[PDB]
Amino acid sequence: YIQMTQSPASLSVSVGETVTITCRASENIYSFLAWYQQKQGKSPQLLVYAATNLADGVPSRFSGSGSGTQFSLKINSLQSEDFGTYYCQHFWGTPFTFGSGTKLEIKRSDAAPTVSIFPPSAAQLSSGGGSVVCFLNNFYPKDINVKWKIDGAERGNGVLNSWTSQDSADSTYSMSSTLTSGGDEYERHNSYTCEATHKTSTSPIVKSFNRAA
Amino acid sequence: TWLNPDPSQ
Amino acid sequence: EVQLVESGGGLVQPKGSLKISCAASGFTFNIYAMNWVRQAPGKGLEWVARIRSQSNNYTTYYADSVKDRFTISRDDSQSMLYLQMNNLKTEDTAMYYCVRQMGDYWGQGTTLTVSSAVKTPPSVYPLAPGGGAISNSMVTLGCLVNGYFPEPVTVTWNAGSLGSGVHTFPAVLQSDLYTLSSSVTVPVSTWPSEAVTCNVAHPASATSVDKAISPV
Ligand SMILES: *[C@@H]1O[C@H](CO)[C@@H](O[C@@H]2O[C@H](CO)[C@@H](O[C@@H]3O[C@H](CO)[C@@H](O)[C@H](O[C@H]4O[C@H](CO)[C@@H](O)[C@H](O)[C@@H]4O)[C@@H]3O)[C@H](O)[C@H]2NC(C)=O)[C@H](O)[C@H]1NC(C)=O
Structure with missing residues (x-):
């Protein structure tokens, strides 16, 4: 079977920049190779077929080249919309195997997260549960540090975080952090703090609330 | 070929 | 234009069975070879099965991790592509894509979740x-x-x-x-x-x- 190895796994590209994704084939596959772009929550769209042929309704900035065993896709002056995950696939025999993928991010000027803190719902309390939610909205770059503080004492137990995919609109990221606790364990303290550390500043963005206030 | 509906390889 | 609409995906108990469907329109279905491709949540694309046109006796192809367990079929009279899935395992949890010929058109997909x-x-x-x-x-x-x-x-x-x-x-x-x-x-x-x-x-x-x- 033919093993397609793709490179690089991920790229952080700025608008106007040009970049090339390469993809090598274990065996000789002549020119039987296609390129796909996939956007999150969507089906892959065909970019280039038979290695060098631009498919219908695809920008001329997409250039496929290569034949034999080494292949590469090239994007000239990458646009904002060119975000996604790029895959190669050979079509020389069964099974058709794919490259491991190339995650493509849009490079952006740094932006601080807007932090929002939320106390456990009054509806959730009457159910015996208690979750404290913290939103960190529209920031760049991706990596971000969240820490919790109850009554001054830190918390690292029931904290579970979720990032979003970089959005097409402004190219930023968002992240929820949800501290889940007993519901009885909640009412034993009153002060609750959410600390966000990010590239933009060394001083953490603190958002807090008092249960007994 | 790619544009052939059902190519025989 | 060319369109492939998937349906049938739901929650299935492990070792269970499910038939997914693909409805085709906007092209001569009976002349094109068809295939299924899957994508586990967060992972990459895996090719699963292929089926040739009637003119080529409907010869079928499978992925090793799916053989003797999944059967690809087609009703040319109704421009329908099917995938029978039996003895489903955890690792079969994925988005299932209906793909035309060699890859020029892809359906939006149906989710299959294999969980107990x-x-x-x-x-x-x-x-x-x-x-x-x-x-x-x-x-x-x-x-x-x-x-x-x-x-x-x-x-x-x-x-x-x-x-x-x-x-x-x-x-x-x-x-x-x-x-x-x-x-x-x-x-x-x-x-x-x-x-x-x-x-x-x-x-x-x-x-x-x-x-x-x-x-x-
Ligand atoms: C899809 O499947 C069909 C059916 O299996 C298939 O069509 C058949 O193709 C074969 C050729 O491979 C044909 O068989 C030949 O028929 C001719 C004419 O009658 C005979 O002269 C041939 O006889 C020779 O070979 C024999 C050994 O099998 C010897 O005994 C003899 O001495 C000769 O040397 C041979 O039998 C068959 O007629 C067709 N059938 C039809 C209905 O057309 C087709 O190939 C498959 N599709 C594809 C594209 O693969």
Whole structure:
């Protein structure tokens, strides 16, 4: 079977920049190779077929080249919309195997997260549960540090975080952090703090609330 | 070929 | 134009069976070879099966991890592509794509979830600010969706009015149960002067909760 190895796994590209994704084939596959772009929550769209042929309704900035065993896709002056995950696939025999993928991010000027803190719902309390939610909205770059503080004492137990995919609109990221606790364990303290550390500043963005206030 | 509906390889 | 619409994907108990479907239109179906491709949540694309046209005696091809277990078939009279899936395993959980010929057109896909976890309606909570000391003209509000199975859920705001300012965060497994939050940024002129409501929908458990966000 033919093993397609793709490179690089991920790229952080700025608008106007040009970049090339390469993809090598274990065996000789002549020119039987296609390129796909996939956007999150969507089906892959065909970019280039038979290695060098631009498919219908695809920008001329997409250039496929290569034949034999080494292949590469090239994007000239990458646009904002060119975000996604790029895959190669050979079509020389069964099974058709794919490259491991190339995650493509849009490079952006740094932006601080807007932090929002939320106390456990009054509806959730009457159910015996208690979750404290913290939103960190529209920031760049991706990596971000969240820490919790109850009554001054830190918390690292029931904290579970979720990032979003970089959005097409402004190219930023968002992240929820949800501290889940007993519901009885909640009412034993009153002060609750959410600390966000990010590239933009060394001083953490603190958002807090008092249960007994 | 790619544009052939059902190519025989 | 050319279109391939998948259907049939749902929650299946492990070692269970499911038939998924692909409806084709906008091209001569009976001359084209067809195939199924899958994509596990978060992972890459895996080719699963291929089936040739009648003129080529319908010869079939499979992936080793699927052989003797999945059977690809087609009804040319109804421009339909099928995939019979028997003895389903955990690793067969994926988005299943209906692909034409060698890859020129892809369907939107149906999700297949192979789990022994039970279907559960979500608990919807409103997220409203607390304490005080507001440092922004825009106030962000949210909805917490707690303890549900399986995926997906659909969170919109105001019947679909609030298009921008909305962030919906993926999901997480803890104990065979999913949890996701949603956020919305609105002016203090708008809120609480207008009624901001979230519209959570869980297709499986036939759930449609609408929660209003009320000042504390
Ligand atoms: C799809 O399947 C069909 C049916 O299996 C298939 O069509 C058949 O193709 C074969 C050729 O491979 C044909 O068989 C030949 O028929 C001719 C004419 O009658 C005979 O002269 C041939 O006889 C020779 O070979 C024999 C050994 O099998 C010897 O005994 C003999 O001495 C000769 O040397 C041979 O039998 C067959 O007629 C067709 N059938 C039809 C209905 O057309 C087709 O190939 C498959 N499709 C594709 C594209 O692969």
